[PDB]
Amino acid sequence: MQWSGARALEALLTVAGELRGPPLQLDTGQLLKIAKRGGVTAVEAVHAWRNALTGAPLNLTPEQVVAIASHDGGKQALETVQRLLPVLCQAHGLTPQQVVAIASHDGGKQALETVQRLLPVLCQAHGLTPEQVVAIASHDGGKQALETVQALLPVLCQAHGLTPEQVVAIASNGGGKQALETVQRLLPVLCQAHGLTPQQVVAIASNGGGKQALETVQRLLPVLCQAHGLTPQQVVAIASRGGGKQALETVQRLLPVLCQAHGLTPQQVVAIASNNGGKQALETVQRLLPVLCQAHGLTPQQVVAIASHDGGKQALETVQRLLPVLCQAHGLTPQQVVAIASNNGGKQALETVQRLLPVLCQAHGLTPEQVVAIASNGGGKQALETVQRLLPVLCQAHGLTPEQVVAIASHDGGKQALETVQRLLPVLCQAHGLTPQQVVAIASNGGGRPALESIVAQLSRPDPALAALTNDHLVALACLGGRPALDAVKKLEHHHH
DNA sequence: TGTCCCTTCGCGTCTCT
DNA sequence: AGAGACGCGAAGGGACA
C-alpha cells in the first residue's frame, strides 16, 4: 500500500466506512483483521457482496463472513461460498458451519471445490464419514490432502496395514499431502530398520510438519540414542508431542550444553522439548536460566516447570520481566508467580494478573490469594477477565457469594464454567429443582461446563436410563467426574436395559 | 500482489486417572 | 493435581504467476 500510483485510495475508504454500515456491522478490529490476511481485494469483495451473504439462501452471520474473508485468497473463497454453499448443504448433507469451516482457510476455493468433487468417491468407495472428509479439508492445502487421501488410502491400508482412522489423522493437518507421502516412503524404513511400531510412525506424522519430523527422526534417531544417550521412546516423544524437526535438531545441538554447563537431567531436557516450539523453550532456558535462577531467585526445577509447556519461551521471558514488578509492587511470592507461569498461556496470565490484580482487589473485593488461584490455571487470563465481567451479575442477578464465583473460576476452563452457570443456573434451579450450591458444586471442577450441559440434557430430555438414578445422585456423579462420569453411566444401560 | 501450500509456534479447554 | 490430547488459529516462509 506504498508505491505504484498517485492520488486515489478514495474508493478504499468509501467501502471501509460502509462496512460499519448495517448489513455486516464491522468494528475497527474486524476491518483491519480482514485487510491484514485477506488484502484489499478481500475488503472490497466483502463490501461488494455484503447483502448477498447476509440474507438469500446463505444467511451467514457477520463473524462468519469475517472468518471466511480473512485469509490469503479470501475473495476467492467468498465467491465460491456463495456459489457452492447450498449445493454442499443440500446435495451432500453438510451443515453451513461445516462449509464455512472448510472455507475459513488459505486456498478455501480449492478446498470447497475439491470437497464437492471428491466427497462422494471418498465416502462411497473408501467408506469415510463426511465428518472425516470435512476434517481433512478444513485446513490449508485441503485440496491436496483430499486428493492425496484418495490416491494413497488404498495403498496405505493394504500394503502398510494402517487403519483409515490413522490415514485420516495424518491427513487432517496442514501439509497432509506431505505427511502422507512421507509416511508411505518411510514406514518400512523406520519400522524394520530403526525399530518403531507403526503406531509410533503415525503418531509422528499426525502433527503439522510431520514430513519434517519423520525425515528428521530417521536421520537423527541413531545419533540421539548412542551419542546422546536417549531412548527411542524419548526420541519419538519429542517428534510426536509437537516439537518436530526443530526440537529434535535443537535437542542434539543443546543437550550437552544444558546438561553439563547448566546442570539439567536429560529427562528434563526431553520434557522441555516435547511440546510446541520446543526449539524456542530450549534456547530460552539456555539463556535466561542463569539470570532467572541465580538473580531472579528461582530453582532449576522451577524453571524446567515453566518451560515444560506450550509457549515456554513466552512464559520464561514474561516471568523474567514481570517477576520483580509482581513480587515487589503487588506482593506475590516467587512461588506464586511460578505457579501462574506453569501453564499454557503463562505469558497471558502474568500480564493479565499485572493489570487486573488491583482492579479485582479494589473494585470487586478479593484477596490476592484468590486472584492467584484463578490465575494459576490453564487459560488464567480468560478466567480473570470473565470473573471481573461476571462477578457482579452472578452475585446480584443470581445470588452467589464471591467465594463461590471464585471457586468456579479456579479451574481449567474457568471462563466456560462461569458463563455456563449464568446460562443454566436458572433452568436447573427452577425447572428441575436443583439448589444453587449443587450447581456450584458441579461447576467447581475441570470440565464444569460440559458437566452442567450434560446434566441439563439428562434431566430436560431423559434417556433410556429411566430415572434409575435420582437427581441428587446425578449431581453427585457429575461432581465426581462430570460428563465422562455420566456418559459412562448412560453407557451402562443403552444396549443393556 | 494475490493465491495456494507448507511449517512452526502459541493459547485455551477437557479428560485421563 | 498434574500430564497429555485435542481444537483452533496466528505467524512466517517458499513457490509461482
Side-chain angles (χ1 to χ4, degrees), chain A residues 2-6 8-295 297-497:
Chain A
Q2 307 290 325
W3 3 305
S4 194
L9 224 184
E10 158 263 281
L12 187 79
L13 272 154
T14 314
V15 301
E18 283 178 350
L19 295 175
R20 305 175 174 286
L24 299 171
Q25 199 76 264
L26 303 180
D27 73 47
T28 323
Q30 292 179 296
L31 287 148
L32 143 74
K33 194 198 186 198
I34 291 162
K36 200 275 186 53
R37 193 75 185 200
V40 305
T41 19
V43 174
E44 285 183 297
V46 163
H47 169 271
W49 22 74
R50 68 189 185 281
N51 294 322
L53 296 160
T54 311
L58 291 6
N59 303 288
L60 298 179
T61 61
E63 35 285 351
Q64 278 176 315
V65 175
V66 170
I68 298 160
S70 11
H71 294 286
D72 292 357
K75 173 191 168 188
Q76 295 303 297
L78 265 329
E79 188 189 288
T80 322
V81 167
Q82 291 169 263
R83 204 219 320 160
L84 299 184
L85 191 145
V87 59
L88 290 169
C89 277
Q90 297 165 37
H92 288 108
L94 300 172
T95 43
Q97 289 134 282
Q98 286 182 318
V99 180
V100 176
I102 292 158
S104 307
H105 293 297
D106 282 4
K109 176 181 179 201
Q110 299 307 322
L112 288 167
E113 271 171 12
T114 310
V115 167
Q116 147 149 273
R117 197 172 55 78
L118 300 179
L119 176 139
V121 66
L122 294 170
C123 282
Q124 333 305 164
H126 304 274
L128 285 165
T129 78
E131 277 56 42
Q132 288 173 322
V133 179
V134 166
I136 296 157
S138 291
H139 297 288
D140 291 0
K143 162 168 164 189
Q144 303 298 328
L146 266 22
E147 285 180 356
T148 307
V149 162
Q150 187 190 13
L152 304 183
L153 186 134
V155 181
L156 290 160
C157 289
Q158 276 73 256
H160 305 272
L162 288 171
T163 33
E165 273 64 35
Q166 291 171 320
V167 177
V168 168
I170 289 160
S172 298
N173 269 314
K177 164 178 152 63
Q178 302 308 315
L180 289 169
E181 288 170 2
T182 312
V183 166
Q184 186 191 23
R185 190 168 73 262
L186 305 186
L187 196 285
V189 178
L190 283 155
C191 283
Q192 190 89 62
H194 307 260
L196 301 175
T197 59
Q199 183 188 153
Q200 286 170 311
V201 187
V202 171
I204 293 160
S206 300
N207 299 281
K211 161 175 179 183
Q212 300 315 305
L214 288 170
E215 289 183 339
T216 305
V217 157
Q218 174 203 19
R219 193 169 65 84
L220 301 182
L221 172 53
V223 181
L224 265 34
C225 296
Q226 336 288 33
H228 290 97
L230 298 176
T231 66
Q233 183 219 307
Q234 280 174 306
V235 170
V236 171
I238 292 157
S240 327
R241 307 231 175 134
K245 164 169 147 183
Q246 295 311 299
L248 290 168
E249 289 186 352
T250 313
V251 156
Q252 186 204 25
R253 183 184 101 114
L254 303 189
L255 221 185
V257 177
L258 285 175
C259 284
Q260 297 165 320
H262 289 106
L264 299 168
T265 70
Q267 288 230 24
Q268 289 169 316
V269 174
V270 172
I272 288 159
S274 291
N275 267 324
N276 279 20
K279 188 222 271 189
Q280 296 305 314
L282 294 168
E283 285 172 0
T284 310
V285 314
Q286 192 197 341
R287 25 172 259 101
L288 252 70
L289 174 58
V291 65
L292 277 164
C293 132
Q294 188 160 324
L298 304 327
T299 64
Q301 300 278 116
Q302 287 174 302
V303 174
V304 169
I306 291 160
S308 288
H309 286 286
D310 286 357
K313 167 180 150 95
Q314 303 310 324
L316 293 165
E317 288 184 5
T318 128
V319 158
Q320 163 253 26
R321 200 223 321 157
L322 301 177
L323 183 51
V325 26
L326 289 173
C327 282
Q328 255 44 261
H330 294 88
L332 306 172
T333 54
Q335 204 206 254
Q336 287 174 309
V337 174
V338 170
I340 289 161
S342 291
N343 283 151
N344 277 28
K347 159 172 179 186
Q348 303 300 328
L350 298 166
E351 289 180 9
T352 319
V353 157
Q354 164 158 67
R355 67 164 252 278
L356 292 181
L357 199 12
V359 173
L360 267 342
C361 285
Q362 282 341 276
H364 303 274
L366 284 188
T367 38
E369 283 71 17
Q370 285 174 304
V371 170
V372 172
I374 293 160
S376 292
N377 278 317
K381 165 170 152 169
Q382 305 297 323
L384 288 165
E385 283 183 353
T386 311
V387 162
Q388 182 186 359
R389 193 190 103 223
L390 253 54
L391 177 45
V393 62
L394 259 24
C395 289
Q396 285 136 57
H398 306 279
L400 301 198
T401 79
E403 282 64 32
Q404 288 183 154
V405 166
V406 171
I408 291 161
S410 294
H411 295 287
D412 286 48
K415 168 147 120 283
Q416 301 310 314
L418 294 164
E419 275 169 11
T420 313
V421 178
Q422 174 178 51
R423 253 210 309 117
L424 297 173
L425 179 47
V427 60
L428 284 175
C429 273
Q430 52 220 18
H432 307 303
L434 282 94
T435 64
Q437 343 73 32
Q438 279 185 146
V439 177
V440 172
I442 288 166
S444 300
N445 267 136
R449 165 158 75 140
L452 289 162
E453 272 169 13
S454 209
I455 216 216
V456 165
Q458 250 293 154
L459 299 170
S460 41
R461 233 244 281 167
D463 249 305
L466 170 217
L469 293 144
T470 62
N471 284 192
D472 270 21
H473 204 138
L474 295 185
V475 173
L477 256 23
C479 302
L480 187 67
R483 178 173 57 178
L486 247 134
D487 291 353
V489 144
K490 223 179 178 196
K491 271 157 237 180
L492 264 163
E493 221 258 22
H494 203 87
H495 265 287
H496 176 40
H497 193 68

